[PDB]
Design a protein around this motif. Structure first.
Motif, PDB file in Angstrom:
ATOM      1  N   UNK A  15       0.991  -0.879   0.487  1.00 54.65           N
ATOM      2  CA  UNK A  15      -0.424  -0.092  -0.318  1.00 54.65           C
ATOM      3  C   UNK A  15       0.912   1.417   0.126  1.00 54.65           C
ATOM      4  N   UNK A  16       2.046   1.156  -0.060  1.00 52.81           N
ATOM      5  CA  UNK A  16       3.192   2.495  -0.612  1.00 52.81           C
ATOM      6  C   UNK A  16       2.777   3.036  -1.573  1.00 52.81           C
ATOM      7  N   UNK A  17       4.030   4.128  -1.269  1.00 53.10           N
ATOM      8  CA  UNK A  17       4.460   4.056  -2.649  1.00 53.10           C
ATOM      9  C   UNK A  17       5.851   4.780  -2.740  1.00 53.10           C
ATOM     10  N   UNK A  18       7.103   3.979  -1.940  1.00 52.47           N
ATOM     11  CA  UNK A  18       7.630   3.663  -2.216  1.00 52.47           C
ATOM     12  C   UNK A  18       8.333   2.041  -2.674  1.00 52.47           C
ATOM     13  N   UNK A  19       9.030   2.410  -4.129  1.00 52.53           N
ATOM     14  CA  UNK A  19       9.358   1.579  -5.064  1.00 52.53           C
ATOM     15  C   UNK A  19       9.761   0.088  -4.506  1.00 52.53           C
ATOM     16  N   UNK A  20       8.987  -1.180  -4.443  1.00 53.04           N
ATOM     17  CA  UNK A  20       9.568  -2.623  -3.904  1.00 53.04           C
ATOM     18  C   UNK A  20       8.705  -3.830  -4.715  1.00 53.04           C
ATOM     19  N   UNK A  21       9.065  -4.688  -4.523  1.00 52.86           N
ATOM     20  CA  UNK A  21       8.190  -5.893  -4.494  1.00 52.86           C
ATOM     21  C   UNK A  21       7.549  -5.568  -4.004  1.00 52.86           C
TER      22      UNK A  21
END
Length: 20
Positions: free
Chosen positions: A2-8
């Motif tokens: 649910x974030x907007x920090x890029x990860x898998x």
């Protein structure tokens, strides 16, 4: 996740879990 920090995500999308 649910974030907007890029990860898998656990579930869906191009971003991190809100937990981590």
């Amino acid at each position: 996740g649910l974030t907007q920090i890029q990860a898998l995500d656990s579930v869906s999308g191009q971003f991190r879990d809100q937990l981590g």
